[PDB]
């Protein structure tokens, strides 16, 4: 048998949250005596902006970052458990993330989102581990 009919194969994603306005900012390295704050990254001036879906298959998320008008991918962050490497989250305000977005080939960032309200942006963090809740053994 030769499974070589196949090799690109990622037609799959569980959808989990999706919003029209997300806004990204490259940020400063991380350390705890600063924290990201939101405040320190480029709120007046995106690095890109577009629309938010966060999506899951089995035991990985993906937290997909796509275009508001050709819709095609800017970035994905692959997760294997929330909180985990791939999602973080700022000191001062509820409404900001940031995620370790990757190639698929060891490639990686660490790239800040933030959202228009802490009432939306609890909608990232809680369609996130209430897909993981049973990896938790919750």
Request: proline letters at 5%; glycine letters at 8%; a neutral charge.
């Amino acid at each position: 048998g030769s499974p070589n009919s196949m090799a690109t194969e990622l037609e799959y994603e569980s959808v989990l949250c999706v919003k029209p306005d997300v806004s990204v900012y490259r940020i400063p390295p991380r350390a705890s005596n600063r924290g990201y704050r939101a405040s320190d990254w480029k709120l007046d001036q995106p690095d890109w902006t577009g629309r938010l879906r966060i999506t899951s298959k089995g035991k990985t998320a993906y937290i997909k970052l796509e275009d508001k008008v050709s819709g095609e991918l800017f970035a994905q962050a692959p997760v294997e458990q929330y909180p985990g490497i791939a999602v973080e989250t700022v000191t001062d305000s509820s409404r900001y993330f940031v995620i370790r977005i990757q190639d698929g080939t060891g490639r990686s960032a660490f790239i800040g989102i933030g959202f228009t309200d802490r009432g939306d942006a609890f909608d990232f963090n809680v369609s996130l581990q209430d897909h993981f809740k049973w990896v938790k053994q919750e």
